Write a protein that binds this ligand. Structure first.
Ligand SMILES: C[N+](C)(C)CCO
Lengths: 504, 508, 476
């Protein structure tokens, strides 16, 4: 079936803005761009304060006994073997976001330097770029991951997101004020959440084709690729799977390419250097406040750290929904360590090669900084290697596949929440959604409340699992063990007492 | 049955400070406060090291299996609800001291900077203040709280610090050479601890009088001796139920936190919550190792005035917080009661210095600057006066430091009575007041001797009377670890895992 | 009993090495030195990366189940108790390194600064020194130590490094490419490793005797200490047990006299000081990849932290043995921390006292750095105190003490890794290989990796211990 109670408020606002951005007061939309500023500096803290709390809590829980609990009907066989499951995360744990931002972020920090430190600090350059792209971002997922996952596969209920809040607003009666609203606010941040990498993919080509053959060629390019959304899911059988390995071959290749063509020793060296520093500056990073230092970091932080936080939150639905799947039969722990450590530790080695070389080239004077342009750097530093174009091609096509990976999946997810949450593949809705610095701004305002949704989600999560039979058993059993062991002891002290007073 | 071997000895020292200091010579009391440099110079390292030790110490017993042991009889349960129990903690975690150092503290740090830190350094400045007022201060309180809550509750001894050394000391009637001694080291330290709070709390008030009237050296003599007269109307002639101002405190303190939160730079104040917890955590070890060798050996002096004082002050109070937290505590687990103590009080102190002290910083950045001529006593009235209707608030402020003194004193003089008479839960109304005035007398006695640097002489004696007790609380770990090893539950468990090992060994 | 298939490939290189660096070839064994740089630069990442994991590793080992099971026969009464055991471990905690380097290093770092900082800072100059001398050099031992012992005392497999690789390789199947290669590079390692701990001592004696008999003679000393490496175990027994104990009392005395005569507070104001800092600066120093800062520390890393790891890596077969040998019946847990808590305390305080005093003297204008050679400095601050020359005499002796206990025992590991990893070996082999030392970084360059696999052979192997094998062979 379809949820035409969640769909209808959906597009009325989706397009209310869409048409509102292309038409009417065309520049009226740039009042919103100056409107986030209310949210960024009034809530920045909220984002940061809770953004970190998100990292500690997920980890305590995995570590906690809650983690042994398995995700699906009691006693279920993993979807993939413990070395076949490994390959699965990559399918979600990468995208177009890594390439445009991934080779410019360490550089841009090694260049300008981050608030609180001097320029040309390779160390911070590595510590601040991972802050955003490793431990922190992924934990915003695994929260929503687990609540969504535990909601559906274990308890055995609906693939709708607001569902995971039934242990707070009750169950089956949280459909109104709170509930439908969540789904609505869910679909929206998934339409905007997508284009933020979709329309972006066109922009990276709008300045990407310069490697071969500008601000209006995007419309022609957008259709070149979008015409392939209706073929991959609508016309072609199956979803993803095939592309997941494509990214390893394509990504793994250009990466091992660079790791062996570019001097390896420096990138390899910065391998522990990357982690080491991360750890040393992670707490200090998490206390960064517009108030610090001297209260002049606000516009840096709104620009970078608050920019990603807000953004990840406004993208955690797709990625909590997508990660839930193919995590059935996997337990809590193995799934939390799953979504962290590895997706975390891939990104890290990725900024280690793109970042290390990108920098080592400024260490000498072969700057890759293409007039301060995110799309220019990527290639500016591989056409500085043999076959710069021979790979630069595979990079284009790498940002091509990624266009449909995100789209494909995203639509899977969004289309899934409009059907009453059922998994079955809905060709019809997957295709319809497909079509549906002002690139970095529309996402974050759109699901501002979401931050409070994942905040409260901690409880709705911890409250609900805590009633899981296995864990319910474990704590019941503790009481019996605790008191039984009481009887055994109170008696002795009456036996060893009566016996004692017998020696008189 | 008042312990007189214990009661008189504590007083012989109480009287000596007051009699020697103001009535006769005066100039000579400041000689013993040359001894203070003595303590910091060559016993300085110890306060610094065992300070950070107490914090680890406590977390690992909480972390340790002992954590599961229940205060009281086996599988006992807490007397009141988690929320109530906690609810007790916020009151425990506020009084005259935050008032005094709420604002000058982190400001003095942004204003002047910290050794190893360039001045105007928000993150550091804040994290140093958090340093003094969170886990390290509260590790100590729990160290002593546990010891007390455990001896009376579990092994059922007398509510006396000595009765918590019994595992390590004879015994056959604990408190021989030792123990009488120990309790004596409690009373005294408990007097000068509360003294400062009574002390700097007083002159905070004389200062505050400026907001309403204008208008003094004799005026501080009046400030205390009046509310000190009103510790008697408070305990001498109790009416209805004695509990009552504890909340009468909380509300005012609430109007102030709320008042300034919104009026003052709110988003900043909010920005300090994530910000300050983080610098803290991040700066937790770097400041842990700040002795008088960093920086270049120049932090020696800075430690003396601040950092060391928190160490001496927290210690010389642990006899009071320690019984308080203990008394409330019965019914918790060591693990539940540790984590509770470090985390719960700490929320408040972190929130407090962010708002009260965190506007003083913001201001100092717009040039407003509440520095008030460099005196910290007046800084609290000052920053408020920079806000709409801050004058009415200054008034409440005084009346707040009023209520605090009586409430600061009664709770002390009860504990101090309780340990002056063989640790009776039942508290003699007549004895308490005695510890009321005696303590008030030394608190006042410290203000008057000093003149313009009245603050200085206060923190240097309370540092000396503390130095002894610090060893007490160090030893108190050792008793505490031997007491927890012989406990039923930890012992009975080691018989079951060695068994859950032996059972499997012979079947295979 | 003498294994002559492992002695040959090693005995040939050793006979050859002393020579090819002699007879007018003395220059071409010098350009050969610079080929060390080659390693530090492409295996630079190698140490600095794992050096730090070993620590976390053992911790994460001592932390988990494996910890509880006793080393050796199921639930055995150990060969000591806590109050006594505590003495035997100390035997390793003190040495010849901790002579010149304790005073000089903390002093150096204070004076010139270490990369990524300013100079004259006391915190960094401690935490940096402690860092090179704490957990980092004791995990690279604990892994060697814990593995060997478990191969023989638990499992009972002969006491020889390759034997610990059984898990990863095969039961009796290692013999081929991996193992024969091990046993040989676990000699080269034992020779040179200790050779860079004695080589500094053959000199520092002549340098330190320029504090006694002001002012060729360097080589006369090598014998006057070596001449009592054989008459110390060959005739009468008990040197390993008797010397280390005495020597600790010497070093203790030394330390204590300086501690008291030297300002007491400063040293004693630096216990919290070093510890607070060592924790604080732990992860930053650890990730001190040369890439930092600005690409600069390449060289600083090469002079000490990285060179530091190699030598330490070189030390794993000889050192890793004894700490395993010493322990029977005592759970790995009471051993991992055993060899982690003690090392930091003996080291920390030791640097604290001597290194810290040095920093104190520099601050008061009383510099003892003069000229600028490591070997001259210890005696510098020494003679700067009452009874200086005198304590200086025992400090002299200290140099030669343990050197004998570390030469007679550097010898023992060889004698036992010669005769099929036999605990007890014939006397002639141990002493004969005691005159061998009578390049450190590349001596052990491959042996790093030998540790890493040793880390997998220690985890994979346990998971085939009885507790984990029984559950394994059950429902699963
Ligand atoms: C709140 N107490 C009075 C218990 C002490 C805190 O300053």
């Amino acid at each position: 079936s379809l949820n035409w109670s969640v769909i209808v408020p959906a597009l009325v606002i989706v397009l209310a803005t869409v048409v509102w951005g292309i038409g009417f007061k065309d520049s009226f939309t740039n009042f919103a761009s100056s409107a986030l500023s209310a949210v960024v500096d009034n809530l920045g803290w909220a984002f940061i304060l809770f953004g970190t709390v998100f990292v500690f809590f997920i980890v305590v829980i995995a570590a906690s006994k809650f983690g042994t609990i398995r995700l699906g009907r009691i006693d279920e066989a993993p979807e993939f073997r413990t070395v076949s499951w490994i390959s699965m995360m990559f399918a979600a744990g990468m995208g177009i976001d890594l390439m445009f931002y991934g080779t410019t972020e360490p550089l841009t920090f090694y260049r300008n330097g981050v608030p609180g430190h001097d320029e040309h600090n390779v160390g911070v350059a590595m510590s601040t770029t991972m802050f955003h792209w490793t431990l922190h971002p992924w934990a915003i997922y695994a929260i929503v991951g687990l609540a969504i996952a535990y909601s559906t596969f274990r308890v055995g209920r609906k693939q709708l997101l607001s569902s995971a809040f039934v242990p707070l607003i009750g169950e089956k009666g949280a459909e109104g004020w709170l509930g439908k609203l969540i789904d609505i606010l869910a679909i929206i941040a998934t339409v905007f959440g997508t284009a933020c990498s979709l329309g972006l993919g066109a922009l990276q080509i709008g300045a990407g084709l310069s490697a071969a053959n500008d601000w209006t060629i995007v419309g022609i390019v957008s259709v070149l690729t979008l015409a392939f959304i209706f073929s991959a899911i609508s016309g072609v059988g199956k979803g993803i799977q095939y592309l997941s390995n494509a990214n390893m071959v394509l990504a793994a290749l250009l990466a091992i390419f660079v790791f062996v063509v570019g001097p390896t020793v420096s990138i390899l060296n910065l391998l522990p250097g990357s982690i080491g520093n991360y750890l040393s500056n992670f707490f200090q990073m998490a206390g960064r406040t517009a108030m610090s230092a001297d209260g002049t970091a606000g516009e840096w932080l709104g620009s970078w750290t608050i920019f990603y936080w807000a953004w990840w939150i406004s993208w955690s639905p797709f990625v909590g929904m997508f990660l839930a799947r193919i995590s059935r039969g996997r337990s809590i722990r193995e799934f939390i360590l799953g979504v962290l450590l590895v997706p975390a530790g891939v990104s890290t080695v990725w900024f280690s090669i793109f970042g290390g070389t990108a920098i080592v080239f400024e260490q000498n004077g072969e700057s890759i900084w293409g007039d301060g342009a995110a799309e220019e750097q990527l290639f500016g530093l591989l056409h500085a290697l043999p076959g710069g174009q021979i790979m630069g091609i595979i990079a284009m096509i790498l940002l091509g596949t990624f266009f449909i990976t995100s789209a494909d999946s995203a639509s899977t997810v969004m289309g899934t929440m409009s059907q009453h949450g059922q998994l079955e593949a809905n060709k019809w809705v997957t295709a319809a959604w497909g079509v549906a610095s002002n690139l970095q701004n529309v996402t974050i305002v759109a699901a501002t409340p979401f931050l409070f949704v994942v905040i409260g989600l901690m409880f709705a999560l911890v409250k609900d699992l805590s009633n899981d039979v296995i864990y319910l058993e474990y704590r019941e059993q503790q009481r019996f063990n605790a008191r039984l062991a009481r009887e055994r002891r109170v008696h002795n002290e009456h036996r060893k007492r009566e016996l004692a007073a017998k020696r008189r």
